[PDB]
């Protein structure tokens, strides 16, 4: 039931203003272009716990306790729920859904594994107008704990050489003097970013937003696309500065060869899922702008096959073969060999399911804050190729695109 | 064209033997071969010809009628003209394509060379073998390729200080081997195509020139509106036993200098396809998968594309043309590079065979292929130079490669 229709650069100050007007209070925001979201409230919720061991249904009528043998059966029984089947679903997976999906043991961090909310509240910016329907930054030194760093990559390069996998991502957590505020974060961080999808979530006293550079996963009917971005220069300096980096990026050997091997990993992913002979690489290793980076980045498509949805794509695809590494499993089990604090929802999905499209956005460039932590994450996809040196450089050059933009 | 079909009992091991002994009987006449899976089409005689010589300035028709001088306004429109024919209409063509087409169409300067332009021709007689089974239509050289190896060097050398300085990014060096005779093309068909898995196989003779190979990949194919290129580029050898062959094929895979070798090759295929196709339709079907090759492998990757509808397979074979594995990058000056660096004509190499017919445009490029005129007898081979590129492996991979046609040359 559509309640208002109030007649687009007063989207962005709106939205804050929501986030601020009704803040304490739970909210979903996505921007999908054309379009913003905002949700508010929540009308149905399906929780899974930070180790996968209990699956919370929640709605007016009160909370059940639902088998979480399948945490993808769990999805699938939220989304064909009475109170949720036609609604649009705001979601969060973190990191070790994937040990969790896998059969590979993990150590659990503290945020949830897995959030769908239908929202009791929603506002939908797109043509100048909004629908509503019812029932001072902050300085960061992003050299700091380098050297540490520089020793995890050259412990993945030593793995890698001796042919314990071919590609992981190493990240880094940079913790925050303060507390942020996230409506501000949001204003003054879009300006600066050109994402394939911004969100900001704040669900159960923990809060995340960020510039997502590219999708795990989009469905539409039977169509899946996934957006693999790999190998990275800046774009810090002025446009013939940049241009060179563009040009100097498409025909480095390191970074191609990580492109590539990401995208024929992101192929055979799909192929899992899709009709023989669907799969179909539709963008071949172009430049993707993401603020204070650029990027090779392809898009790879196919037709799911008939005994296969959405959440079966999503549990192959997840998280981004760029994210985790190849082989995936292997690249999975190093990083929580090599990596000391707990991801969370840093390199998982956010989630907006809707009747025309399935679509997951990549978390990074994205900063996070709960009772007990606050902080940025970058990491660097480090093959037989790498330099610990210029992987530092490349998470410092991906963290100026969060890092200047959060206001205290 | 009076008709004929023939079941020959004739086991497998016999059915090649057949057909290059078939060829022996052809003599001293025009005749045209190309196999493209599961046939062998082989062509005698001259009904029609389209020829267009060497510099390009002159397009002639002939038939029964005569000859007849076309305007060589448009190379494509008088291919169109030729296909459009009464003469021509219903039947096989079989066509060579030179180097040098390229430069012509984009209006580079060139250095023609004696071999024409292009060719295409509808054979007095034709005969299809096809799995034992006929359908009629009537009315050991020993080659050193080390040899000279020292030159190539220099010029491999000449090509990465070029790239280096930024000339362009990729290209094409090739060495010619003069050879000591004459070769036999039957013989030389038959032990060569045995040794070798190639996409297609040619051999034609035609106004006393003549070419024999065994074709790694397809320039184009175009089946009503549907475009297919596959570029094949990046190597290593496939010389040796199965565990050594699928070493280097790992190898190939994850070599960082053969991947950009190879994607450098891929997009701007990706790019020339482009220009031809509606928007949205061309899409990699297979990204750089390793491909046998007789005595080596390479990357290869599938590209597809729908032509739009003001474009036709003469429109994608001139932007496809010849394959950027064969040129370089960008194509232009990497074809000026070649004119600048390469000392004997290509002629052929490098060039393009064709088989059309009714569904479909078929063109295999040439390379792993032998030359024979009236002045030169020759094999050649290249290696696509990049930035990384090293003269003594460059060298080392045109001998992998002749190693597809030195050894079975025969006289
Ligand atoms: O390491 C990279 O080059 C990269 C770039 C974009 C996203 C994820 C990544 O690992
Ligand atoms: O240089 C190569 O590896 C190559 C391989 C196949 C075809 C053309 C080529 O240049
Ligand atoms: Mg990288
Ligand atoms: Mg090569």
Known sequence: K??????????????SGVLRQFAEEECYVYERPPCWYLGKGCQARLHINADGTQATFIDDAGEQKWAVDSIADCARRFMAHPQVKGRRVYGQVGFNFAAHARGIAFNAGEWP?????????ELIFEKGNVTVYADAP???????????????????????????????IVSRAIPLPSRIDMPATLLYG?????????????????????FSPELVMSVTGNKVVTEPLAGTRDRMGNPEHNKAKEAELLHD??????????????????????????????????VRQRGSVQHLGSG?????????????AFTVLFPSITASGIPKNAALNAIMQIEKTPRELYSGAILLL???????????????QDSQRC????????????????????????????APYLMV
């Not at 208002?4 to 939205?15: A, N």
């Not at 024929?264 to 899709?274: M, Q, S």
């Not at 809707?354 to 996070?368: E, I, N, P």
């Open 138 to 168: 902050l300085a960061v030194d992003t050299a700091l704990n380098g050297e540490a760093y520089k020793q995890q990559v050259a412990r993945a390069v030593a793995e890698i050489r001796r042919g314990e996998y071919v590609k992981v």
């Open 354 to 368: 809707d009747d025309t499209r399935f679509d997951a956005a990549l978390v990074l460039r994205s900063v996070f």
């Open 300 to 312: 790879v498509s196919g037709q799911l096959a008939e005994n296969k949805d959405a959440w079966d």
């Open 190 to 210: 879009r300006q600066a970013n050109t994402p394939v999808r911004s969100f900001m979530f704040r669900q159960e006293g923990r809060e995340a937003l960020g």
């Open 375 to 402: 902080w940025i994450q970058a990491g660097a996809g480090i093959i037989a190729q790498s330099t610990p040196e210029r992987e530092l450089t490349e998470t410092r050059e991906k963290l100026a695109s969060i």
């Open 113 to 121: 594994l897995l959030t769908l909310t239908v929202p009791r509240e």
């Open 253 to 286: 050997s390191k970074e191609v060869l990580e492109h590539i091997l990401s995208v024929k990993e992101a192929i055979a992913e799909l192929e899992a899922v899709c009709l023989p002979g669907s799969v179909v690489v539709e963008d071949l290793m172009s």
């Open 2 to 15: 559509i309640s208002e229709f109030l007649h687009e650069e007063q989207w962005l100050p709106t939205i």
